[PDB]
Ligand binder design. Structure first.
Ligand SMILES: C[C@H]1O[C@H](O[C@H]2[C@H](O)[C@@H](O)[C@@H](O[C@H]3[C@H](O)[C@@H](O)[C@@H](O[C@H]4[C@H](O)[C@@H](O)[C@H](O)O[C@@H]4CO)O[C@@H]3CO)O[C@@H]2CO)[C@H](O)[C@@H](O)[C@@H]1N[C@H]1C=C(CO)[C@@H](O)[C@H](O)[C@H]1O
Ligand SMILES: *[C@@H]1O[C@H](CO[C@@H]2O[C@@H](C)[C@@H](O)[C@@H](O)[C@@H]2O)[C@@H](O[C@@H]2O[C@H](CO)[C@@H](O)[C@H](O)[C@H]2NC(C)=O)[C@H](O)[C@H]1NC(C)=O
Ligand SMILES: *[C@@H]1O[C@H](CO[C@@H]2O[C@@H](C)[C@@H](O)[C@@H](O)[C@@H]2O)[C@@H](O[C@@H]2O[C@H](CO)[C@@H](O)[C@H](O)[C@H]2NC(C)=O)[C@H](O)[C@H]1NC(C)=O
Ligand SMILES: *[C@@H]1O[C@H](CO)[C@@H](O[C@@H]2O[C@H](CO)[C@@H](O)[C@H](O)[C@H]2NC(C)=O)[C@H](O)[C@H]1NC(C)=O
Ligand SMILES: *[C@@H]1O[C@H](CO)[C@@H](O[C@@H]2O[C@H](CO)[C@@H](O)[C@H](O)[C@H]2NC(C)=O)[C@H](O)[C@H]1NC(C)=O
Ligand SMILES: *[C@@H]1O[C@H](CO)[C@@H](O[C@@H]2O[C@H](CO)[C@@H](O)[C@H](O)[C@H]2NC(C)=O)[C@H](O)[C@H]1NC(C)=O
Ligand SMILES: *[C@@H]1O[C@H](CO)[C@@H](O[C@@H]2O[C@H](CO)[C@@H](O)[C@H](O)[C@H]2NC(C)=O)[C@H](O)[C@H]1NC(C)=O
Ligand SMILES: *[C@@H]1O[C@H](CO)[C@@H](O)[C@H](O)[C@H]1NC(C)=O
Ligand SMILES: *[C@@H]1O[C@H](CO)[C@@H](O)[C@H](O)[C@H]1NC(C)=O
Length: 1771
């Protein structure tokens, strides 16, 4: 039916909570029966026929509205249903709603709360909430206006309102619910899974059976979401009740009487909700200072002497101890207001003894008074009480009810009776006159009774046996308490039971006012109600000495802070059972940080006071150590109690109250805070020396050392030995301290101190409340000191806010401890701006960054300012004067910098001390962060090179889970941005949950911090001095995550890893032969860094302007650019390979090369004619040395003029065609510069002056003329002139095309199309297969332009010249003018000054496109000048090397660096370009060079021939051998290129890419990998016939023998004769290979094979990519073969991923399979499964070498038909 229509089984409200459900009761109650459901879900639920309806409308009133409600016709559940109910709502405050539901005709019981008085005000306006009332069925709804969230919804279930049964169900916005009490909940956040909690005060042990305990708390807090927005609910009802939780989420209150009186409290944070609640029920009492000390107690010390012995022992141990408790043993026969005259003779003297030692006495007092009084043995308390008629009475209202407790048969005082309060006061006065005690411990105030009801039992009434009972222990209300019909002043026990303890605390608080003189005392109670914390402290009851109770103590303590009873703790070491030393040790450690810290032992158990465990025990030493820490921090703790008392803050706090933005804190219950500042992490498990703890997102300092921890927003395993607890100070807070003593009396006479814990912005704040520590109402009477402390910019402000109290002890602040600071210097103290004559001492620990300032005397009660300067250590110094000339003390100071002529090499004399920019408007959004940066120091910014930029914007974008961008730019003016397109997501995906990183914007100074979320490692930190942003000078610095950095180019690095020891490297494209600290052909502002744990990241700066980078040993890196904006991209890894795959995804994946380009190549600068190339070709073929590509340098051209053919090369076209017919490929070189001095028709220049393609001067529009290769026509070029004379007399004037321009692109494609197919003579055509574009830096042999020269000196000689080669010659050195103008594709004008380093990049793509068009095949481009994204279309060679021995290792470093740059096709000129080759060097270089991806032997003009057929037959044999090896491996190499192209894997690989765990590989650059599996270990030294190589922890097989050298993690010297190169295959890999031939054309027709290298587990994996090796976009158009191959359990399987290339019509023939590491057992049989056929191949197994060779050449097997191969061993 539609009545039973409950959408969701989780929204069912249990209709039969009182018994097991049957369809019979569900039918009588008119509900809905459905036994379909999960566990714990109701089967009988309420219909919609149950509830009330609004009659009429909502009549409005002065405070809110009133509504009349009539009951809907439904069956009665428990009888006596109230038909007419009145709703009275009130808008008391902007953040406090109150509504009440009561009977309309009769008056019912309402809680007489002492603090909460009837509201008489009018409705508040505006409100932060809205209230909605539904008419039928009736429901109330409270909605937060700011976000329209429903906080409180009563529609989920019906309103039930009967005489002895009331119910209201509320749907909640979230499942984050806290509170409800008193119970052992076991966890802090509630389990909303069908759990019911009874609330009815009862004397019973807390044990985790979900029973009701000593108090009654109905308040709960709910955290809406991670904004902090929170609300609370409070029900003012004292009757017996239960609260049921359901997973909707919803809360149901079920009570046995009274009214429904609700308060809804709103707050922006959890703490504000608590504050609102406490302001309504009553703010907690401020305890006496001595009560914050440590307390000792036992039930049954037996005699006074035993008690004294305990006192003396603990004193002798010098344990911090201030209060002794006396339990019922001190009394006479367990009677109150008495002491035993025999066993406790001298009790008053004990009190005096404690006082003479600065200790206090707390005595116990029970509510029950012995009724045993006779004339012969009078008992005064009873007689006086009976005379006053102040007892709880039987139902007749006259006869005192008789119960039983400790003294036997007892009467119970009625504390709700005012006469009782007077009696109570008087009794305390008479006993205080006998024994001078300091505080009162009230117990058994539930009220407890050893019998049920009374000695005579309870009557059969509906009060003692109500129709509904709330799941209370034992199932009757009058169990171990009084009869429910018992009569008190406030009402029947049925209504006021839960108020008994509350009422007694009130009466006791009144007594204290009279007995103690103007002294706030201390009241400790067990039974509590809402508002009890205004009078008394609370303890969590009779726990047991178990690890569970230790664990449960923390959530209990946290809840009571919510309830407004912050002075709370559990019995340390357990009340019941004997404690172990370990348990008591780990409890004393955490117990030291309970707000109420007391050790309390039960009767008949082993002693457990700390000194009992022995004077040298670890427990005693540990207890003394952490109790001393507690005493040091009492001023801090006391101030927290002040905030609790004055405002309603929580003292012991949950982590979600401070860090609610992290959902990893919403359920933390094994850690807690004191206030906002002190994190406590205990060990709560037996035998544990480690804990898993959450460290929230803040700066944290180890309390004991003062050092900063590296944890932040991460789960950590904390090492906490038996004597250690986790204590951490939060940054941004100041902690008042006092030198500790054994008592609070003694400590308060000692000097004060400050701990200043600095945050990210280098700031902190604190407070200090200080009074007499004892007097009453010291806050309302305003007799106190209040200080506010603040630190900013190295200045401490000590400000008094209140000063009406004077301390008699002349206290002073003597020490200031600063955490997270640099060494303070020149400390100055002022008192109201007047200098104090003092010379403070500073002790500093540089390792911990902790400073101690002593010999200061800041008198308590006065205002002070303390200022200091900071000293910068040499390692943290940043060059303030990196300029080329003008360094001096004078010019340094003019920049606002500091000068120090230190001697340490590398350290700068002039360094920054101040910041130029400030940060503001820091906003953190879901997909990024933004901030405004504003110039503060205009004068000093203007002393640095170039004009400052005033306004800057910082934009952080979270692109992906592993990639982010941060940009700093000028929002007011468009500045140059690099026009190189990058690949970023269209919509951000760096979702907070998935992303691998966090970003933080810091102040003082401005800095961006990026952290790896998983380990908390900071990979980028710009919080260094030096940030400058001028028009032509921008500086930025970062701290490095370690000392391992790789990248930056292009230059000749000494090693693969950078030397971070004061070294500067310039970047600006230049024609410079590679050298030390010299800028070369390309620019790659990219680096990869290794973190100390082996995680890796990468950083790109997208800037093309001239720049340099500096490395300091901090470690730190600084970037200094001459223009542009700051545009950084960060890749998160975490692996070196994943970083490169991420980097290449951003900048573009490497180009797929043609198969023939992987063959060996020959070139020489200085071929005399076409016949010399023909002779070399024939000789190579004759010698059978494989080679695929022949090149020609600028010799085939007429006078080096581009797009011409020299007469000496008239036969070159025919030769090209002949070579091609035999399978050879030709690459030609093209230069960019075009001659303007031709007398005969020269189409290139004429058609380019017509199209306007050349770079011209900014405004006039003349061509910027340079000089490069073309000679003048009709002159005689003597070859005996020097280089300088030839450039001045023989070189023609040349014009440089602008390759950014559309017209230039069109003109360049036409010239190349006509070079391929000559439009005039169709015979002078040159049918090339690829192009070599050289001299594109652009390079000129003059500086700037032909003389007269350049024009704008401002751009050619810039304000800041980076550390470039020929630094004094300017940016125009060996290049074009910087004023030259270029035009982007969209028409925008740019200066050569901005785009110089993009010149080669801009030429590359057009060249690539035209080659693919004229040849119809993919082709290959090789450029000298490269920029990030250049590898998408071209390869790169490492430039003009020299024939020298050091150049072979430099080649290995260059190839590994270009692999990180995303250029896979690279190599060096084999045998050197400059100087004559030597035989041995050339032989070894041939062996190394055979494993370059780009493997070319190239030589300069003038030198001896260095090609393989130029030496002797020994060389021919070495060359042939190694090159045959190369051609065998081409399928493997080709597959690697495919993987680079498609996935962004690296081809040439440093060992650290595959073995990052071994730190030995972090410095290796003399060996390398091809892909993951092939290790190359060359000889790079002369005369050597051996090589020392490292073998990472893996199985490594000798390539030539198949035998595994056993070297796992070891160095090994390997034999390396002149005709040998050491090659090794890693186990676990399958390598495809093919039989070598003269060139790739013939080789591809031969048989293909597999080398299968098994790992230790006998497994291997590998890949094969195969296509036609030359067509365009074979993978994109789907004409290829791709397969993976695997071996396990002696079976090799083929898994074809894709195949539309290899077929029966086009077979790839499989011939050979070699399996290595098959074991020593003989191989009996080998079988191949192919095309549903079994082929038995020919096989040979060598048991000694463990190599199995399988030959399948006879079976005509094409690879696409191969399924699996299986081999079986001899048993
Ligand atoms: C001192 C104490 O005296 C009275 O308590 C009695 C109680 O009435 C008995 O029920 C009995 O307690 C047993 C528990 O009921 C029973 O469950 C079992 O408890 C287990 C728990 O279930 C386990 O979970 C826990 O791990 O271990 C305990 C025991 O190991 O066994 C209990 C027997 O130990 O005995 C106790 C006495 O031990 C009285 O009712 C209590 O209120 C009273 N405590 C207050 C009085 C005094 C004396 O001045 C103060 O010192 C205390 O601080 C007060 O709280
Ligand atoms: C093609 O050129 C070769 C080589 O030229 C010589 O070496 C050049 C670097 C340069 O110095 C030239 O002036 C040289 O002539 C020519 O072969 C040489 O021919 C001369 C006779 O003219 C002979 O004495 C040399 O031994 C030859 N050198 C070699 C290395 O073989 C050749 O004649 C030219 N071919 C044509 C068709 O002109
Ligand atoms: C590997 O070589 C070392 C070094 O050999 C010398 O240096 C080479 C670069 C080359 O110039 C060789 O001709 C040199 O002999 C061997 O160690 C030397 O062995 C000789 C022979 O007794 C001895 O006299 C030298 O003092 C050694 N020098 C050094 C530097 O150790 C080494 O034995 C070879 N490794 C193995 C295991 O064969
Ligand atoms: C203490 O209280 C008890 C209970 O009220 C009193 O004892 C009862 O006294 C009557 C006679 O008046 C006896 O018949 C009962 O047997 C007693 N009760 C029980 C349960 O045994 C006792 O008089 C009181 N003591 C005083 C007032 O000194
Ligand atoms: C090929 O040339 C090499 C180097 O010119 C010759 O090897 C050298 O021979 C001399 C003796 O004639 C030895 O003293 C050197 O140590 C050798 N140098 C090496 C090995 O690099 C080699 O003999 C020649 N082979 C021939 C002529 O076929
Ligand atoms: C080799 O290729 C096969 C497909 O032929 C890959 O198989 C898939 O592997 C993923 C996990 O990586 C599984 O979720 C898929 O179900 C697999 N598909 C099939 C068809 O089995 C395999 O991962 C590749 N790697 C190797 C060497 O086995
Ligand atoms: C692989 O097996 C083939 C047979 O299918 C072998 O080929 C023969 O080799 C012998 C010895 O050189 C020659 O006499 C025959 O003329 C070869 N026949 C063919 C079909 O070429 C081949 O030698 C084996 N390869 C290896 C390395 O063992
Ligand atoms: C080339 O230069 C040499 C060296 O000075 C000179 O002797 C010779 O005559 C020149 N050749 C010419 C100009 O024919
Ligand atoms: C070179 O190899 C050939 C062919 O194996 C061999 O005959 C010759 O002896 C080897 N040595 C030299 C120096 O020619």
């Amino acid at each position: 039916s539609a009545e039973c229509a409950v959408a969701n089984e989780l929204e069912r409200i249990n209709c039969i909570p009182d018994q097991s459900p049957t369809k019979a009761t569900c039918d009588q109650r008119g509900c809905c029966w459905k036994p379909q459901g999960a566990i714990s879900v109701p089967w009988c639920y309420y219909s919609t026929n149950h509830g009330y309806q609004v009659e009429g409308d909502l009549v409005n009133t002065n405070a809110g509205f009133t509504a009349q409600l009539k009951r809907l016709p439904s069956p009665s559940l428990f009888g006596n249903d109230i038909n007419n109910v009145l709703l009275r709502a009130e808008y008391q405050t902007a953040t406090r709603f109150h509504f009440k539901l009561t009977d309309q005709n009769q008056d019912r019981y309402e809680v007489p709360h002492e603090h909460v008085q009837p509201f008489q005000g009018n409705a508040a306006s505006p409100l932060t909430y809205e209230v909605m009332v539904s008419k039928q069925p009736f429901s109330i709804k409270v909605i937060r206006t700011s976000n329209s969230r429903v906080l409180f919804d009563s529609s989920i279930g019906p309103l039930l309102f009967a005489d002895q049964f009331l119910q209201l169900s509320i749907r909640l916005p979230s499942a984050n619910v806290y509170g409800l009490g008193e119970h052992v909940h076991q966890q802090y956040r509630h389990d909303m899974n069908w759990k019911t909690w009874p609330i009815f005060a009862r004397d019973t042990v807390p044990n985790g059976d979900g029973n009701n305990l000593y108090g009654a708390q109905t308040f709960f807090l709910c955290l809406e979401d991670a904004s902090g927005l929170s609300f609370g609910v409070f029900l003012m009802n004292s009757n017996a009740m239960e609260v049921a939780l359901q997973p909707a989420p919803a809360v149901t209150y079920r009570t046995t009487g009274g009214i429904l009186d609700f308060y809804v409290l709103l707050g922006n944070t959890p703490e504000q909700v608590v504050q609102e609640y406490l302001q309504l029920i009553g703010l907690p009492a401020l305890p006496p200072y001595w009560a914050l000390g440590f307390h000792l107690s036992r039930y049954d010390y037996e005699t006074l002497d035993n008690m004294r012995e305990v006192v003396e022992r603990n004193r002798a141990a010098q344990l911090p101890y201030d209060v002794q408790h006396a339990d019922i043993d001190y009394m006479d026969k367990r009677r109150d207001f008495t002491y035993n005259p025999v066993d406790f003779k001298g009790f008053p003297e004990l009190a005096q003894d404690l006082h003479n030692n600065g200790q206090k006495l707390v005595i116990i007092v029970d509510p029950a008074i012995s009724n045993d009084s006779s004339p012969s043995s009078p008992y005064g308390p009873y007689d006086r009480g009976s005379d006053a008629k102040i007892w709880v009475n039987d139902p007749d209202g006259v006869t005192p009810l008789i119960g039983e407790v400790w003294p036997g048969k007892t009467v119970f005082p009625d504390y709700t009776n005012p006469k009782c309060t007077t009696w109570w006061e008087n009794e305390f006065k008479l006993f205080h006159n006998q024994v001078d005690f300091d505080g009162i411990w009230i117990d058994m105030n539930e009220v407890a009774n050893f019998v049920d009801g009374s000695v005579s039992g309870c009557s059969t009434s509906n009060l003692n046996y109500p129709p509904f009972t709330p799941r209370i222990l034992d199932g009757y209300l009058f169990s171990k308490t009084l009869c429910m019909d018992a009569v008190q002043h406030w009402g029947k026990q049925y209504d006021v039971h839960n108020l008994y303890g509350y009422s007694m605390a009130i009466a006791t608080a009144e007594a204290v006012k009279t007995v103690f003189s103007n002294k706030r005392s201390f009241i400790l109670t067990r039974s509590t109600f809402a508002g009890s914390g205004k009078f008394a402290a609370h303890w969590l009851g009779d726990n047991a000495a178990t690890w569970d109770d230790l664990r449960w103590s923390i959530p209990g303590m946290l809840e009571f802070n919510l309830f407004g009873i912050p002075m709370v703790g559990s019995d340390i070491c357990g009340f019941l059972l004997d404690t172990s030393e370990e348990l008591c040790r780990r409890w004393m450690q955490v117990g030291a940080f309970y707000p109420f810290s007391r050790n309390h032992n039960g009767q008949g158990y082993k002693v457990q006071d700390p000194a009992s465990f022995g004077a040298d025990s670890l427990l005693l030493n540990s207890s003394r150590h952490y109790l001393s820490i507690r005493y040091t921090l009492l001023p801090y703790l006391y101030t927290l109690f002040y905030h609790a008392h004055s405002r309603g803050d929580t003292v012991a706090r949950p982590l979600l109250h401070e860090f609610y933005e992290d959902s990893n804190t919403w359920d933390v219950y094994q850690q807690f805070l004191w206030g906002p500042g002190l994190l406590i992490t205990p060990v709560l498990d037996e035998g544990a020396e480690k804990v898993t703890a959450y460290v929230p997102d803040a700066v944290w300092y180890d309390y004991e050392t003062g050092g900063r921890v590296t944890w932040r927003k991460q789960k950590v395993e904390m090492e906490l030995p038996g004597d250690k607890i986790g204590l951490h100070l939060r940054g941004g807070y100041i902690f008042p301290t006092q030198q500790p003593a054994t008592t609070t009396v003694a400590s308060r006479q000692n000097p004060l101190g400050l701990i200043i814990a600095l945050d990210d912005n280098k700031e902190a704040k604190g407070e200090l409340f200080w009074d007499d520590g004892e007097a009453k109402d010291t806050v309302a009477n305003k007799v106190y000191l209040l200080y506010e402390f603040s630190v900013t910019q190295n200045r401490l402000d000590v400000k008094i806010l209140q000063s009406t109290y004077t301390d008699p002890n002349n206290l002073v602040f003597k020490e200031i401890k600063i955490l997270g600071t640099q060494e303070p210097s020149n400390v100055i103290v002022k008192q109201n701006d007047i200098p104090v004559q003092v010379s403070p001492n500073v002790a500093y620990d540089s390792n911990l960054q902790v400073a101690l300032i002593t010999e200061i005397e800041l008198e308590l009660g006065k205002n002070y300012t303390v200022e200091w300067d900071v000293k910068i250590r040499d390692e943290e110094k940043i060059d303030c004067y990196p300029d080329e000339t003008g360094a001096s003390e004078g010019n340094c100071v003019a920049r606002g910098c500091a000068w120090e002529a230190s001697t340490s090499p590398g350290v700068p004399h002039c360094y920054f001390v101040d910041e130029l920019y400030s940060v503001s408007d820091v906003q953190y959004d879901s997909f990024g962060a933004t901030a405004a940066i504003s110039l503060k120091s205009s004068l000093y910014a203007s002393a640095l090179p170039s004009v400052p930029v005033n306004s800057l914007r910082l934009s952080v974008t979270y692109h992906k889970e592993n990639m982010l961008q941060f940009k700093i730019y000028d929002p007011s003016n468009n500045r140059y941005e690099v026009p190189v397109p990058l690949n970023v997501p269209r919509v951000p995906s760096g979702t907070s949950e998935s992303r691998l990183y966090d970003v933080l914007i810091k102040k003082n100074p401005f800095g961006i911090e990026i952290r790896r979320k998983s380990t908390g490692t900071v990979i980028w930190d710009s919080q260094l001095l030096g940030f400058t942003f001028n028009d032509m000078f921008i500086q930025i610095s970062t701290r490095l995550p370690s000392q391992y950095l790789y990248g930056f180019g292009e230059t000749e690095h000494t090693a693969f890893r950078r030397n971070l020891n004061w070294h500067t490297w310039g970047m600006f494209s230049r024609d410079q032969p590679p050298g030390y600290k010299m800028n070369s052909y390309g620019v790659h502002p990219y680096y990869m860094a290794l973190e100390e744990d082996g995680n890796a990241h990468g950083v790109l700066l997208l800037n093309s302007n001239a720049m340099d980078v500096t490395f300091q040993p901090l470690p730190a890196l600084t970037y200094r650019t001459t223009g542009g904006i700051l545009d950084f991209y960060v890749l998160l890894g975490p692996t070196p390979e994943l970083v490169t795959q991420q980097y290449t995804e951003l900048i573009g994946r490497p180009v797929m090369v043609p198969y023939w380009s992987l063959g060996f190549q020959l070139c020489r600068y200085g071929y005399e004619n076409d016949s010399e190339i023909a002779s070399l070709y024939e000789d190579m073929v004759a010698a059978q040395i494989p080679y695929d590509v022949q090149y020609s340098d600028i010799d085939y051209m007429e006078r080096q003029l581009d797009f011409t053919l020299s007469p000496k090369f008239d036969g070159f076209p025919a030769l090209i065609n002949r070579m091609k017919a035999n399978g050879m490929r030709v690459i030609l070189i093209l230069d960019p510069a075009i001659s303007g001095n031709e007398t005969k028709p020269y189409p290139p220049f004429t058609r380019g002056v017509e199209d306007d393609v050349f770079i011209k001067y900014p405004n006039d529009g003349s061509i910027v003329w340079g000089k490069v290769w073309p000679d003048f026509p009709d002159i005689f070029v003597n070859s005996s002139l020097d280089w300088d004379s030839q450039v001045e007399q023989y070189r023609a004037y040349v014009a440089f095309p602008d390759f950014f321009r559309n017209s230039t692109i069109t003109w360049w494609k036409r010239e190349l199309r006509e070079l391929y197919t000559n439009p005039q003579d169709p015979e002078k055509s040159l049918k090339f297969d690829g192009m070599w574009i050289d001299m594109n830096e652009p390079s000129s042999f003059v500086n700037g332009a032909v003389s007269p020269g350049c024009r704008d000196s401002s751009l050619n000689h810039p304000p800041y010249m980076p550390y470039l080669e020929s630094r004094n010659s300017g940016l125009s050195s060996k290049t074009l003018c910087m004023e030259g103008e270029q035009i982007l594709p969209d028409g925008s004008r740019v200066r050569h000054y901005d785009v110089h380093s993009l010149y080669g990049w801009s030429q590359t793509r057009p060249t690539y496109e035209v080659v693919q068009e004229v040849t119809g095949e993919r082709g290959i481009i090789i450029s000298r000048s490269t920029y990030p994204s250049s590898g998408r279309w071209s390869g790169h060679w490492l430039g003009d090397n020299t024939a020298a021995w050091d150049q072979l290792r430099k080649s290995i470093i260059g190839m590994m660096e270009f692999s990180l740059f995303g250029i896979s096709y690279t190599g060096a000129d084999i045998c050197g370009f400059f100087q004559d080759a030597e035989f041995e060097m050339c032989a070894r270089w041939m062996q190394l060079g055979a494993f370059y991806p780009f493997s070319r032997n190239h030589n300069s003009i003038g030198t001896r021939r260095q090609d393989p057929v130029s030496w002797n037959d020994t060389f021919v044999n070495i060359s042939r051998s190694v090159l045959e090896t190369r051609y065998t491996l081409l399928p493997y190499l080709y597959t690697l290129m495919h993987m680079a192209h498609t996935e962004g894997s690296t081809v040439v690989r440093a060992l650290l890419h595959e073995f990052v765990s071994d730190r030995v590989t972090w410095d290796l650059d003399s060996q390398f990998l091809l892909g993951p599996a092939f290790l190359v270990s060359p000889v790079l030294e002369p005369n050597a016939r051996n090589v020392t190589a490292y073998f990472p922890r893996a199985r490594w097989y000798d390539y030539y023998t198949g035998v595994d050298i056993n070297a796992r993690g070891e160095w090994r010297d390997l034999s390396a004769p002149l005709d040998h190169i050491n090659l090794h295959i890693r186990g676990g890999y399958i390598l495809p290979w093919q039989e070598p031939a003269q060139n790739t054309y013939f080789s591809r027709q031969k048989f293909m094979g597999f080398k299968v290298a098994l790992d230790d587990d006998g497994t291997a994996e590998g890949w094969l990519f195969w296509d036609d090796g030359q067509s365009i976009d074979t993978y994109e158009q789907g004409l290829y073969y791709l397969a993976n191959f695997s071996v396990s359990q002696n079976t090799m399987q083929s898994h074809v991923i894709f195949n539309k290339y290899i077929s029966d019509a086009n077979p790839l023939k499989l011939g050979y399979i070699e399996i290595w590491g098959v074991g020593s057992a003989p191989i009996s049989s080998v079988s191949i499964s192919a095309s549903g056929e079994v082929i038995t191949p020919i096989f040979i197994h060598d048991s000694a070498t463990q190599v199995l060779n399988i030959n399948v050449t006879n079976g005509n097997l094409s690879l696409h038909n191969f399924s699996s191969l299986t081999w079986t061993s001899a048993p």
